[PDB]
Design a protein around this ligand. Structure first.
Ligand code: ATP
Ligand code: MN
Length: 335
């Protein structure tokens, strides 16, 4: 994930309350900047929310009063914030503050060169087992790009049609089969079945192991586990359950399209395998800007009386996929 990249200043607009600052559009994001830091069309380094930036008075003095400890080192975590009434996200700095990047090009990922890293909520301790092996290379990891970083693609996909589903807030979990072996994995490892492992227990109680055996194909069930003991259980659940959102065809190396997934989950439940699916909302004919898509992010969740974290969109061909995280949710939750 490109936590710090080189980007272009979009349109700049005043903020009436405090004229020492102004509102700057970096592609889909809005920043508060110092007035006269950028004119539109200038390049700079933009750090995304969740960046953790080590303490530097020369380079990041504007971060000096939100310094925290994190996993041993001292630095600043970027979150959604409301600065003098203006909702602002990330940090945009001009290039004359980065001499060692003087001849980098727009679009470059300078995460590693600046030592940026990602602040992460601590381990949910009921969800970490013993590791049989790494995540299998013949399976794609579950990762969604943010719509604020895709404005060119949204204009390209004008006219395309997308499946819209609720984005649950839980940890990712993969159950798969390759020919005589059925494995359970979290985000980055394949785990051994214990009387401990939350993922194995989710897999066994909805029987997706015999289900995958039954279906007799090299498929990867990918879902979020959510519920008790998981990210504050904002969905008011009893227990923990598996909610699917993608199926990776291992042999063809590509995800199932929505209707294929939809009919395969149907096939699974028909034969008595209790695989739940992330909530599907009605499909979308993309004719939108990033702002309008974000504007759909707020709304009812799996529990219809709680505000969802956001939405994810899947182009029906199955090859284009992005999320749009609710900013109201991000503001009503700082961790
Ligand atoms: N409806 C959904 N469709 C796809 N993924 C979903 C859905 N609901 C929840 N998820 C979760 O979304 C996550 C994948 O998105 P993402 O790549 O943003 O996660 P991340 O790598 O943990 O976060 P980030 O990279 O943005 O810091 C997975 O952890 C998966 O469990
Ligand atoms: Mn990711």
């Amino acid at each position: 994930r490109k936590l710090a990249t080189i980007r272009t200043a979009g349109e700049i607009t005043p903020i009436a309350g405090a004229e020492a600052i102004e509102c700057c559009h970096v592609d889909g994001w809005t920043c508060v900047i110092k007035k006269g830091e950028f004119k539109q069309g200038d390049r700079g380094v933009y750090f995304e929310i969740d960046s953790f930036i080590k303490e530097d008075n020369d380079r990041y003095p504007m971060l000096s009063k939100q310094v925290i400890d994190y996993e041993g080192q001292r630095g600043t975590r970027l979150r959604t914030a409301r600065l003098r009434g203006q909702l602002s996200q990330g940090l945009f700095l001009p290039m004359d503050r980065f001499p060692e990047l003087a001849s980098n090009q727009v679009g470059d990922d300078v995460t590693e060169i600046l030592g940026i890293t990602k602040w992460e909520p601590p381990i949910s301790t009921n969800l970490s087992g013993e590791i049989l092996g790494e995540f299998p290379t013949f399976i794609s990891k579950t990762d969604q790009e943010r719509v604020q970083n895709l404005i060119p693609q949204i204009e390209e996909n004008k006219g395309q049609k997308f499946e819209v589903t609720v984005k649950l807030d839980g940890s990712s979990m993969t159950v798969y089969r390759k020919d005589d072996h059925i494995g359970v994995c979290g985000r980055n490892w394949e785990l051994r079945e214990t009387a401990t492992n939350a993922q194995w227990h989710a897999a066994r109680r909805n029987k997706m192991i015999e289900g995958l055996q039954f279906l007799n194909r090299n498929l990867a069930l990918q879902g979020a586990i959510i519920g008790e003991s998981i990210q504050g259980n904002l969905e008011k659940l009893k227990g923990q359950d598996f909610y699917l959102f993608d199926i990776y065809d291992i042999d063809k190396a590509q995800y199932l399209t929505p209707i294929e997934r939809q009919s395969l989950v149907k096939q699974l439940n028909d034969n008595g395998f209790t695989v739940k699916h992330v909530p599907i909302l009605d499909d979308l004919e993309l004719n939108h800007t990033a702002e309008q898509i974000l504007a759909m992010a707020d709304g009812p969740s799996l529990n219809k009386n709680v505000k969802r974290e956001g939405l994810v969109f899947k182009r029906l061909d199955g090859k284009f996929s992005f999320k749009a995280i609710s900013n109201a949710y991000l503001e009503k939750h700082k961790d």
